[PDB]
Design a protein around this nucleic acid. Structure first.
Lengths: 65, 110, 87, 95, 94, 95, 109, 83, 96
DNA sequence: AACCCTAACCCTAACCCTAACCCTAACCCTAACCCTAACCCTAACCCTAACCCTAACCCTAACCCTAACCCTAACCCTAACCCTAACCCT
DNA sequence: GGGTTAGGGTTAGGGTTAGGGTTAGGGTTAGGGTTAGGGTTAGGGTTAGGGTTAGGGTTAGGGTTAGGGTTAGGGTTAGGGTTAGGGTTA
């Protein structure tokens, strides 16, 4: 499961980042290793919604100056 | 002789026209007798539907840094909502394309 | 006189750079051996049982030009309404 | 040379992110004119009419190709077969 | 003429009410015009059949309100029904 | 007691004319009655739209003759058109 | 108010031209209808009525039931290429369609 | 008969002969649930249409004519019952 | 017992050459009554209405089973799969 | 519609992988034969609560009302997204 | 290869009244759904069989996944040499 993730980044080596991305991907692997923290691993690349507060960006001014 | 003759917003509270709906429904050979407070319901329904469609189109167009509703944005907004997909399922909007949907088997997996 | 090309397009033109380009929009990746041939035949009926309706409509009003106002009523009978070019 | 499996997806994304016409206009007009001649002679065509016809034909072809691909990919086959089009037409009820 | 036009002013007013500094394009106006006339003959067409099936010929507010739940799905049907009821209430009030 | 409209006498006469010593059953009469009323609202319904599309309001013999080629297929449409033309000719010949 | 020449037979069809036109106005179509419209209404619509009646009794010959029954009426439509392709919004109750166990559905072939 | 005692009204040997009329020889296992769910969804749609129709007519008895009209509106012109 | 190849075709021909009902009436009536109670209480049913409902359901089930068998027999498989029904419903346009 | 230019994008043709198709091996999923043992409605027998006609009077149905307002692309115009030089990593 | 600063170029945005169809209530009054004595149709109980439906067991009993022939379908070719676009009128 780690080699397939390593081959995605064009890397034939099993670096700790690949193992961290592979363990935190599978459901059973994450449930079994939920408290284990891999050194030099990192967080999974994932953003978060609800970040922009203006969304609609309406015309508070006017067309004629 | 009369008085102020004030009104609401326009004539009932909707921006959609009322004098043309009753005319097109009476002269459209739909029924020999048309009600008085009947075209207001259809006008309000059409106004709400148009407002929802335009809001969805604007929300879909604002993502591409373009404040102008184009038919592509309309096609993207119509084919995204679940309530609007079942209504206009047999409608093919011209110059709209399709949706970026690629099967997972076609992608180079393991 | 007249040109010898009286074939009036024997259902051609739509070949490799057209059928593949149209299939790439949907989701088709590869194309087998046959695939074509009948691809230009399934579109023949779509114009056989649709343009006839427009001709029959224009024949009722004693006209001779199939405008855009009559091509939308023919497609509405089958169940494929088009918005924009019709009006 | 490029390994086969990335240029196809790139072309698919490029053609899906664009709204340009793929079929020509004059050949399609000549084809529909030849078809109309089979029923009644002395017939003309316009521009918006043939444009709507081309748009409807493109939409129908896209839908048919998508249905054929979705029918073929469910049988452990990445390619489609000439019988899959007839199968989809029989299921949809086109005859 | 005999008044056969297009829905442009009302569409632009609705768009400006729901989204400021916005507008419609070229083909989008014709698309919306063809969309309005399509549902105009679908909702009003079912009311005539519904009135004829009950040996009647009066299409009032209830004939259009009931036709909403038939054409529109679920949440949109209830919203349109509420909007129509509020509109007919504001009309009957003044 | 308000009676209900039903096509029974004409159906039986047509059946006896096309097949002697024959008749209709129980549910077959209701099936034919529901079939007649179904096509009655389909052919006459298209004529109104066809007359309204041309800014007209007169549904004559041509409005029904042209609607035959739209609903009926090929050979049945030509046969129905020929029958209708012969009927209107026999009607216009003698009243 | 003179003779008994009813409009139901004023043209020459088994369907009542005078009564089928009394229902023609019962549909809220166009107003002024021509004299040939009721004649064209009882001629091209009675054709589909007659074509299904005479074929269900023919299908009863294979079932040894003689008279037209509701079961044979659905098979009467699918007896020729002109009646099956004619109707689209038609579904008769019982039916019992032709068991299309062709040579292909049979062992190989 | 108001809980889950009627939703499971489709058995397993009785549905075997039902599919045999069309031309099915062998079925499976999850078909008894998938077909039941599809039938439940379709019946909910048809029942909702008939309820809307009988509410337009202000009636509380679902007649055969309303069911036929709803089926024709959906796209299934059923013959036999009604008119 | 023993696996066959002739009893199935015999039963198919027997059930195709007959026009008898296969589903019961009282269970279907109770089911449609429970379904109608979910929307509005105090509702009744007739006989011709539930008969037409049963006929329409039988026709829809026959068509769906025929489509499923025709989709499964084209993939070198004599049996059908639970995903074939969803595939046919997706192609016909019943769910998506 | 058929009537001389345009003049640069657009449509055939070649070698080498991935992919389509057949042959086995062996577990594992799937139809009925006479034993299973309560079991199961629908066919008969009643006995229930307001829906159908019912329609004489009662309080609204849009009809012609003829005076307001709205109004619409052009107005001659301006409000967004332009399209070549300029330009973020492939 | 795509977003972006300069630059117009069609293409959006706000009244201006011009006024002409279009909908709107009392003066009516209306005949259908309730609300009204008979006549109807669906729903709750009752009883006994007989054909329909849950269940093991069994059968070695018939569809079904890893290797490995090929033949068949992709990317470049790179000119080049035929066709597809856009501006002319009469």
């Amino acid at each position: 499961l780690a080699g397939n993730a390593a081959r995605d980044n064009k890397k034939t080596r099993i670096i700790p980042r690949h193992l961290q991305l592979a363990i935190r991907n599978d459901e059973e692997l994450n449930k079994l290793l939920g408290r284990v923290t891999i050194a030099q691993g990192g967080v999974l690349p994932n953003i978060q919604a609800v970040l922009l507060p203006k969304k609609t960006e309406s015309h508070h001014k006017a067309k004629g100056k | 002789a009369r008085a102020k003759a004030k009104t609401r917003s326009s004539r009932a509270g909707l921006q959609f026209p009322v004098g043309r709906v009753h005319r097109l429904l009476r002269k459209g050979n739909y029924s020999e007798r048309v009600g008085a407070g009947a075209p207001v319901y259809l006008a309000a329904v059409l106004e709400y539907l148009t407002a929802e469609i335009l809001e969805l189109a604007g929300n879909a167009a604002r993502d591409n840094k373009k404040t102008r509703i184009i038919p592509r944005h309309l096609q993207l907004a119509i084919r995204n909502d679940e309530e609007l997909n079942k209504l206009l399922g047999r409608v093919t909007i011209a110059q709209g394309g399709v949706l970026p949907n690629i099967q997972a088997v076609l992608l180079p997996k393991k | 006189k007249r040109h010898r090309k009286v074939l009036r397009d024997n259902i051609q033109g739509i070949t490799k750079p057209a059928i593949r380009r149209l299939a790439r929009r949907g989701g088709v990746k590869r194309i087998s051996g046959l695939i074509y041939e009948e691809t230009r035949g399934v579109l023949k009926v779509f114009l056989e049982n649709v343009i006839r309706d427009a001709v029959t409509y224009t024949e009722h009003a004693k006209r001779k030009t199939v405008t855009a106002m009559d091509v939308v009523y023919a497609l509405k009978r089958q169940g494929r309404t088009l918005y924009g070019f019709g009006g | 040379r490029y390994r086969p499996g990335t240029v196809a997806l790139r072309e698919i994304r490029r053609y899906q992110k664009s709204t340009e016409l793929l079929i020509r206009k004059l050949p399609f007009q000549r084809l529909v004119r030849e078809i109309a001649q089979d029923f009644k002679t002395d017939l003309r065509f316009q521009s918006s009419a043939v444009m709507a016809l081309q748009e409807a034909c493109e939409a129908y072809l896209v839908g048919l190709f998508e249905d054929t691909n979705l029918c073929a990919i469910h049988a452990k086959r990445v390619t489609i077969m000439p019988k899959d089009i007839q199968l989809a037409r029989r299921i949809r009820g086109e005859r | 003429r005999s008044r056969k036009e297009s829905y442009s002013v009302y569409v632009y007013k609705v768009l400006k009410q729901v989204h400021p500094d916005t507008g419609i394009s070229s083909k989008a106006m014709g698309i919306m015009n063809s969309f309005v006339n399509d549902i105009f003959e679908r909702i009003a067409g079912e009311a005539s059949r519904l009135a004829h099936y009950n040996k009647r010929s009066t299409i009032t507010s209830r004939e259009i309100q009931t036709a909403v739940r038939l054409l529109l799905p679920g949440e949109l049907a209830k919203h349109a029904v509420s909007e129509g009821t509020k509109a007919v209430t504001k009309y009957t009030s003044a």
